[PDB]
Amino acid sequence: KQDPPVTHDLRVSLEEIYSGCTKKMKISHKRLNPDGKSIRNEDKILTIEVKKGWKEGTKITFPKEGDQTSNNIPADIVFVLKDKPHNIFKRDGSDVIYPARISLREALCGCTVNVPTLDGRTIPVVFKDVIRPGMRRKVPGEGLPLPKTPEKRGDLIIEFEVIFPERIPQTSRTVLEQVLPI
Amino acid sequence: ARKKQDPPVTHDLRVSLEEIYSGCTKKMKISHKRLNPDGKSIRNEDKILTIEVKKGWKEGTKITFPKEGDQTSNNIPADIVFVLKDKPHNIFKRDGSDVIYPARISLREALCGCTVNVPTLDGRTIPVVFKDVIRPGMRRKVPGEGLPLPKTPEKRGDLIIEFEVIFPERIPQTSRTVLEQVLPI
Amino acid sequence: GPTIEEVD
Amino acid sequence: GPTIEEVD
Amino acid sequence: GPTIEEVD
Amino acid sequence: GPTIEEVD
């Protein structure tokens, strides 16, 4: 009879996933006293080395490190890696999505998007085909290191949102009726 | 001289939107073992279990027929729990007591004006005219054209038109020079 | 005859 | 266990 | 359940 | 020095 696993969410930010980092988690668990008179309280440091590019849901288990409130086997402590909301990107496995907003005019007459990168630069990507709503374009190798092959990286994905007007003049309306494909 | 109860058996009850709209009856035939007169002998029996599906019932509604499970000389037969499940509908999508009508329109229709004939679950058709620009994902509520609220079926949710705006695969340079001069800033 | 547990 | 099927 | 907390 | 079970 071993206590059922005790689960703790380990919130890591995207920059931490990018570089890999260290997390010290201090537990206070209950431990039978050196003499079985008391169930005491004890501190311990559990150090998790977050590998570069690990994915949400990765399990880091420290066996038997839960309470000994019982005369039975203490539960495993299982740290579960969660992604922390980013203010620019949305993570996606080893890819990072960049949401980019454009005018309808830009979606059909072309644009430049100056795309932020993980290392705080911007990358020009000019567009010259129709940009549909929800269209993705990969910028290869500008995502997160692949946790297994961390010399190699995934990609950065540009996902488009196309901003329409409310009002269109009469002349524009007649023209767009005559000229639009399908 | 005590018995003891088997856990409930679950069974899905799949029901279309139109059937949720109006109500219906469903007959489930259950074949189960029953304990004879003598408390020792066991027969197979069939029994019809009739479920009046109420107007507007939501997915997950439970309809329990107590002790309709297999009987032993010894047990309390299990409850048979029917759980209501939506049948996917090929046109509508269910959202509680709202009904979503995905309407696919070209970017032409989206920018130039168009008209959408909204079908209703009971056969009617409601034309809705859009004079202004329609955006991707745009919703337009058609009041009271949804399902009965199940606790109060005099009452109705809404039908929501939700637009997907289809863009062309390509635009030839000749078009783009023309588009450029007429699309707003 | 059946008892109904309703979804709100 | 019991067998259940829908009927017309 | 045991208390857990990040530290430097 | 935990056991690591990975998402792929």
In spatial order, strands of the major sheet of chain A run 6-7-11-10
Q: Radius of gyration of chain A from the CA trace?
A: 26 Å
User: What fraction strand of chain C?
Assistant: 35-45%
What structural category characterises the helix and strand content of chain C? mainly beta
Computed CA radius of gyration of chain C, to the nearest angstrom: 7 Å
Q: Name the biggest interface.
A: A-B, 28 and 29 residues
Series of H and E elements of chain C = E
Largest sheet of chain A: 4 strands, mixed
Say what the CATH topology of the largest domain in chain A is.
HSP40/DNAj peptide-binding domain
- Helix count of chain A equals 3
DSSP summary, beta strand count of chain A: 11
The CATH class of the largest domain in chain A is identified as: Mainly Beta
The helix content of chain A, as a percent range, equals 10-25%
Shape of chain C: rod-shaped
Subcellular location (chain A): Cytoplasm; Nucleus; Nucleus, Nucleolus
GO molecular function, one term (chain A): Hsp70 protein binding
GO cellular component, one term (chain A): glutamatergic synapse
Keywords (chain A): Chaperone, Cytoplasm, Nucleus, Phosphoprotein, Stress response
Quick summary of this structure?
Chain A has 182 residues and is mostly beta strands.
SSE layout:
The complex is a heterohexamer, with two copies of chain A and four copies of chain C (8 residues).
Chain A: E1 6-12, H1 14-19, E2 21-32, E3 39-50, E4 59-62, E5 77-83, E6 90-92, E7 95-103, H2 104-109, E8 111-116, E9 122-127, E10 136-139, E11 156-163, H3 170-179
Parallel strand pairs in A: 1-5, 7-11
Antiparallel strand pairs in A: 2-3, 4-5, 6-7, 8-9, 10-11
Chain C: E1 3-5
Written description of the protein model:
The complex is a heterohexamer, with two copies of chain A and four copies of chain C (8 residues). Chain A has 182 residues and is mostly beta strands. Chain A has two domains: 1-85, HSP40/DNAj peptide-binding domain, CATH 2.60.260.20; 86-166, Sandwich (HSP40/DNAj peptide-binding domain). Helices cover 12% and strands 43% of the residues of chain A. Chain A has helices at 14-19, 104-109, 170-179; strands spanning 6-12, 21-32, 39-50, 59-62, 77-83, 90-92, 95-103, 111-116, 122-127, 136-139, 156-163. Chain A has a four-stranded mixed β-sheet. In chain A, a hairpin with a 5-residue loop joins strand 8 (111-116) and strand 9. Chain A is elongated and about 90 Å long. Chain A starts with 5 loop residues before the first strand and ends with a helix. Chain C is mainly β and 8 residues long. Helices cover 0% and strands 38% of the residues of chain C. Chain C has one strand at 3-5. The radius of gyration of chain C is 7 Å and the shape is rod-shaped. Classes of the chains: A mainly beta (182), C mainly beta (8). The A-B interface holds A 103-105, 107-110, 129-130, 132-134, 162, 164-168, 171-173, 175-177, 179-182 and B 106-108, 110-113, 132-137, 165-171, 175-176, 178-180, 182-185. Strand 2 (21-32) of chain A pairs antiparallel with strand 1 (3-7) of chain E, so a sheet runs across the interface.
